[PDB]
């Protein structure tokens, strides 16, 4: 199937120079694989998955050096942004970046990403063409004009089309040691007399994406249905449930459906006493 790599980078300032804290996290196929954190005693890129321990000390030293440069870039940018937004000294501020690439099942580049956020809000983003920039804010225009003149987009295009794809191909070869299908069941819960709660659980699944539906007649009952956001069990898998209020006795009339990419086809089930 398809593959991806991402680097999520953050710098956070707090009042009191001291310098900002810089954290970099790498992901391959939406799973953390490397991590740098400037708060560490001896700041380094560290492996975060067993398959990454293959890499020798030359890798870790190269990447650590890059992280130190990125840390400085974030410092300077954070300071520039304070001026752009006429923010005074005395506050907390956040600068974030997402960079990386999507590959198809054929391992060809499908899309490059290069986005920034300030205070948790979109600041500037390289468009899918990898040539032009989207910048909402009036302040972000200063940046966009600068980066048009500096040829920033071509620089990042080169990394996204080259190094990103190259390195992702490498990491995909190094990592051989999936989907986990959900296991669903309905639980019976009492409610205000006459009514009951049927709650459909999905457990043990990976990736997190899943849909739960209740039907009568049927006729999906989105209106009054209750659910929770998909949550990590903590073991690498996810949980979710959906529930509905139902007249007592007439519970065999309602059916829960579970849609997941790991399934050969959707699961259909109901309460079994």
């Amino acid at each position: 199937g398809p593959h991806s790599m991402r680097y999520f980078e953050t710098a956070v300032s707090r009042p009191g120079l001291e310098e900002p804290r810089y954290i970099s996290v790498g992901y391959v196929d939406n799973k953390e694989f490397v991590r740098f954190d400037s708060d560490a005693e001896n700041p380094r890129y560290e492996p975060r998955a067993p398959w990454m321990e293959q890499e020798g000390p030359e890798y870790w030293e190269r990447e650590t050096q890059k992280a130190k440069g990125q840390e400085q870039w974030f410092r300077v940018s954070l300071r520039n942004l304070l001026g752009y937004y006429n923010q005074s000294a005395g506050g907390s501020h956040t600068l974030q970046q997402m960079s990386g690439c999507d590959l198809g099942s054929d391992w060809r580049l499908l899309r490059g990403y290069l986005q920034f956020a300030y205070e948790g809000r979109d600041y500037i983003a390289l468009n899918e063409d990898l040539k032009t920039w989207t910048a909402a804010d009036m302040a972000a225009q200063i940046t966009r004009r600068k980066w048009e003149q500096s040829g920033a987009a071509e620089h990042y295009k080169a990394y996204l089309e080259g190094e990103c794809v190259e390195w992702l191909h490498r990491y995909l070869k190094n990592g051989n040691a999936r989907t986990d299908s959900p296991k669903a069941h309905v639980t019976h819960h009492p409610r205000s007399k006459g009514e009951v709660t049927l709650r459909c659980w999905a457990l043990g699944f990976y990736p997190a994406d899943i849909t739960l539906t209740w039907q009568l007649n049927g006729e999906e009952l989105t209106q009054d249905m209750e659910l929770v956001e998909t949550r990590p069990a903590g073991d690498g898998t996810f949980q979710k449930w959906a529930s509905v209020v139902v007249p007592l006795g007439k519970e065999q009339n309602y059916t829960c459906r579970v849609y997941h990419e790991g399934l050969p086809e959707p699961l259909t089930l109901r309460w079994e006493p």
């Binding site: 190269r62 890059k66 990125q70 942004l81 600068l95 290069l114 600041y123 990394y159």
Partner: peptide, 9 residues
């Protein structure tokens, strides 16, 4: 491997 950023914001 992660990007090396170009010009500052």
């Amino acid at each position: 491997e992660g990007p090396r950023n170009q010009d500052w914001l």
